[PDB]
Design an enzyme around this catalytic site. Sequence first.
Site, PDB file in Angstrom:
ATOM      1  N   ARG A  45       0.878  -1.162   0.000  1.00 48.47           N
ATOM      2  CA  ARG A  45       0.000   0.000   0.000  1.00 48.47           C
ATOM      3  C   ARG A  45       0.918   1.215   0.000  1.00 48.47           C
ATOM      4  NH1 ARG A  45      -2.280   2.968   4.551  1.00 48.47           N
ATOM      5  NH2 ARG A  45      -4.333   3.855   4.063  1.00 48.47           N
ATOM      6  N   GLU A 135      -9.058   7.533   5.145  1.00 47.16           N
ATOM      7  CA  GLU A 135      -9.816   7.684   6.386  1.00 47.16           C
ATOM      8  C   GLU A 135     -10.685   8.938   6.290  1.00 47.16           C
ATOM      9  OE1 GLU A 135      -6.791   7.631   9.663  1.00 47.16           O
ATOM     10  OE2 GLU A 135      -7.386   5.543   9.902  1.00 47.16           O
ATOM     11  N   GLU A 245      -5.506  -0.951   7.370  1.00 51.33           N
ATOM     12  CA  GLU A 245      -4.594  -0.404   8.364  1.00 51.33           C
ATOM     13  C   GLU A 245      -4.747  -1.041   9.741  1.00 51.33           C
ATOM     14  OE1 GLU A 245      -4.196   3.796   9.094  1.00 51.33           O
ATOM     15  OE2 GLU A 245      -4.628   4.235   6.987  1.00 51.33           O
TER      16      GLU A 245
END
Length: 332
Positions: A45, A135, A245
């Site tokens: 990522r 996020e 995450e």
Amino acid sequence: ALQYKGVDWSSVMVEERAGVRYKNVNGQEKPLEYILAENGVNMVRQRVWVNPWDGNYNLDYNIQLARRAKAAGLGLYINFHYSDTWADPAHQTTPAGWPSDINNLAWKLYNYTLDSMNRFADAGIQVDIVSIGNEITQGLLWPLGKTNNWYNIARLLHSAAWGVKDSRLNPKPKIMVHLDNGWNWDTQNWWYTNVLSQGPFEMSDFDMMGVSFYPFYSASATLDSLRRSLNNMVSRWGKEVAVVETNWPTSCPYPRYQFPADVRNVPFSAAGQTQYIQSVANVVSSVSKGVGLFYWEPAWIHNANLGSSCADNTMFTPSGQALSSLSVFHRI
Ligand SMILES: *[C@@H]1O[C@H](CO)[C@@H](O)[C@H](O)[C@H]1NC(C)=O
């Protein structure tokens, strides 16, 4: 078992420039991408910033990484922050220079994403997953895309989703929407409901719903809640899901919050990381459409706490040698 299993290794070059050298568990020095592939990782990522002050994590920077990641046979997950700096629930700073009206900002987000994706396409790099934001629970590109501005948000995401769709990328990567607190279902529900009811952002505009799941930000982050949340999300919107995450410390002398009751038995050590990462994988796998798990910055030795109240969340030695726990990527 998980389709997507990897780590976010964005800091790798910043660390190399700082003199860091990585080795597998046996002390054999090699470029990180190979130590990762060696341990079962099948995808990395990478965070992408618009106009970073020092160039790190910008397009060029991410292209050098991608090319390297590809040479080691690792898949690519591009993580757009749509900001010059760190984007999270409390910070979604629109890049200086970008427009102030929803139509132009959206247009900009489109050109930006479009050109960025084409950057990889033209480079011959295949992007497998793309999160249009990082996020973005409280929205993105503030002030316009700040939460409760549901219209502007769906508006912004639609444009971003299409910047990907209209690119030279082929095959096209799965488009993902990334929210934090994946364990909190009311949040996941409130957000998507409000965004998807607007109209501009359609169900066919995205493919994945990614979530951040950490143990040190609230005792509420139980594996069960994540388990329930994912099931609720999947059954409701039918999208593939993934924990994009997560971390587990090998040292956490001064936690700011009590850890979830279900993991208070898990030790802060390489063994504990394995145990935790595996438990989280089981939750994701248990869910139909549960398809991925990504550990965040396992090799950022010069930033061990990784922005948390814990002292060390890395899966590496302070000198850069891979810890045994890194090979958990084989078991999942
Ligand atoms: C987006 O790109 C188009 C054509 O490439 C350009 O005409 C337009 O001004 C751009 N949008 C903004 C506001 O940057």
